Each structure stands twice: as structure tokens, then as C-alpha cells.
Nucleic acid binder design. Structure first.
Ligand SMILES: [Mg+2]
Ligand SMILES: [Mg+2]
Ligand SMILES: [Mg+2]
Ligand SMILES: [Mg+2]
Length: 234
RNA sequence: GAGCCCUAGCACAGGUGCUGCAUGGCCGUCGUCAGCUCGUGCCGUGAGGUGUUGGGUUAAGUCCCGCAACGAGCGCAACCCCCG
């Protein structure tokens, strides 16, 4: 189910904060706003999903990023709802590019997995039960979706690339294909497979980002429900 | 002419004689001041920068939140002694 499902509540977004490189994917300045030509949305979807498919059934790992305010959660849903890695709270200087080092944080996160369930089940110089169980605190918060990922992904999926630029940069540096949902905010030129959409409305992120995860599990057989995601959707 | 010890020579001893501006070691000092760095990534043609900066907080670069950085090292703290 696609087509008018998109016009559902998810077409055009921002106005007069545009990138004129995005002028190709626009329908009009109707009532002050940029409303985004959907025929070409759909157009780009086929090519993009086509890439996802092939990538997925060839057994690839996509890396999902959405640190954005109201995308935050509907990421770690569909990301985990497909066993793919995700970056949720904040992108870090050189997850990809400084990958080896940023990994020793995960290498050392699960050292503390294995100190919870431990012979030190309740022991070690008692003020070290915040000193270390608050190290695992931060480690937890950030590397929760990143922890799976043990070689660079074969792709990345991004919700707002002008928001998420520090990532996309690393991607392109590393020849890693950039998949993203992008609106009039953004610079198409450096998004390899674009979902000309709406970086913002939670429904729009949902419709799109879930289907893409359908396609992913569905390209290893075993489709499920209407997705464990409708947040407080409101 | 084994050792030892004497006098005559010999190779050497000795020197608190100079150079702390040839030096080691040890000390003083800014100063127990909250600092000085490195590894990798990143930015810059480059010297270099980021990190360490910022907002809150500490006796402290002490910790917190934030952030193209993420972590480490010598410091600080703690591990030692005395007094309750
Ligand atoms: Mg001297
Ligand atoms: Mg000297
Ligand atoms: Mg003198
Ligand atoms: Mg002198």
C-alpha cells in the first residue's frame, strides 16, 4: 500500500529555508510553503527500495540514523524490528571514520554487561558502584544500537541529512552508500538514493521508515504486522 | 731477592688546585598552582587547531550537561602515616 497513502499526511514540508538544488523535486509555493512533487517522490522510492532490496537479500547491514527530536523513537523501533543497527541520541565524531577506536567503547561496554551478572555481583570499593555503574550509564545511552554493527555498514539510512550531515560526510568519505529521507532543507547531490519526502512530520517518518523495514525482513521472508510503532503518535 | 719490612731508582700516588657555562646525582623555585600532553579521527596549503572550548560545579582539567570527536598518559583525587 503506497501512492495516496503518501498524500495521506506526508507530502511537502519547509518554506524559504530551502536549498535550490532541491528545486527539481518541488511542485509549488502554494500558500507560502514548498509542496513537494509526489509523482517524483514515488519515482525515487522504486529506485531506492530496489537498492534496499538487493542490498538486504544479499544479506547486507544498513545503519539507521535519526538523532532528530521526533524521529528518535520511531527509529529504534524499525531498526530493531529488523535487527539492523541504529544511532539514536547523538552522532559521534567518527563512528564510521574513527570506527576502530569508537568501537573500543562497545568492546568495553559489554565488559560491564559482564560485571552486572558477575562474581562482583555486589562487590568492589563501594563508591565505585556509581564510578563504574555510571560509566555503563552513558555507554548504554549511546551505543545501544551501535553495539551490533561490528564492521562498517554497506549502507546508511538517514532521516534529515542536513540535520545529520556529520554522518553523511563520513559515509561519502568512506564510499558507503547514503540512503535518506530528505526535504527542501537538503542538498540532494550527496544523497545516493533519495527519498524526497518530509524530514519532520512523525507520520511521514513512520509511513516511510517502516515500509523500508518491511522490504528488509520481507527480503528474507516472514512479514509481520502494522509495526510496533504508533508511539504516542499525537 | 717466598712473604714482610728498610734505603736507591721506576710505573704512579696525592691535590677541598680551576671550570656547576663541559656534567651526574641531589636540592631550591614558580607551585600542591590545575595544569602539561598523547593516540587515533576530524579542520587547515601550513605553523597549527579540535580534544582541553562552552553553560553548571568543585579545593582541583572535581565531577555534570553540551559538543567532530572518542579515548587514554604525567597531574588532582584515592591507595600510606599520625590525630579524633
Ligand atoms: Mg646549573
Ligand atoms: Mg646539576
Ligand atoms: Mg656560584
Ligand atoms: Mg651560573
Amino acid at each position: 500500500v503506497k501512492e495516496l497513502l503518501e498524500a495521506g499526511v506526508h507530502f511537502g514540508h519547509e518554506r524559504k529555508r530551502w536549498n535550490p538544488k532541491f528545486a527539481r523535486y518541488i511542485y509549488a509555493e502554494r500558500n507560502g510553503i514548498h509542496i513537494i512533487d509526489l509523482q517524483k517522490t514515488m519515482e525515487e522510492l522504486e529506485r531506492t527500495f530496489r537498492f534496499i532490496e538487493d542490498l538486504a537479500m544479499r544479506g547486507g547491514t544498513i545503519l539507521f540514523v535519526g538523532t532528530k527530536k521526533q524521529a528518535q523513537d520511531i527509529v529504534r523501533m524499525e531498526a530493531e524490528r529488523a535487527g539492523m543497527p541504529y544511532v539514536n541520541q547523538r552522532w559521534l565524531g567518527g563512528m564510521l571514520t574513527n570506527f576502530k577506536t569508537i568501537s573500543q567503547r562497545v568492546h568495553r561496554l559489554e565488559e560491564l554487561e559482564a560485571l552486572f551478572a558477575s562474581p562482583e555481583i555486589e562487590e568492589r570499593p563501594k563508591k565505585e558502584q556509581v564510578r563504574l555503574k555510571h560509566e555503563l550509564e552513558r555507554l548504554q545511552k549511546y551505543l545501544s544500537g551501535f553495539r551490533l554493527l561490528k564492521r562498517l555498514p554497506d549502507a546508511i539510512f538517514v532521516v534529515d541529512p542536513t540535520k545529520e550531515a556529520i554522518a553523511v560526510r563520513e559515509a561519502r568519505k568512506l564510499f558507503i552508500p547514503v540512503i535518506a529521507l530528505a526535504d527542501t532543507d537538503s542538498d540532494p547531490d550527496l544523497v545516493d538514493y533519495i527519498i524526497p519526502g518530509n524530514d519532520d512530520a512523525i507520520r511521514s517518518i513512520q509511513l516511510i521508515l517502516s515500509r523500508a523495514v518491511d522490504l528488509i525482513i520481507q527480503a528474507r521472508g516472514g512479514v509481520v504486522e502494522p509495526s510496533p510503532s504508533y508511539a504516542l503518535v499525537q
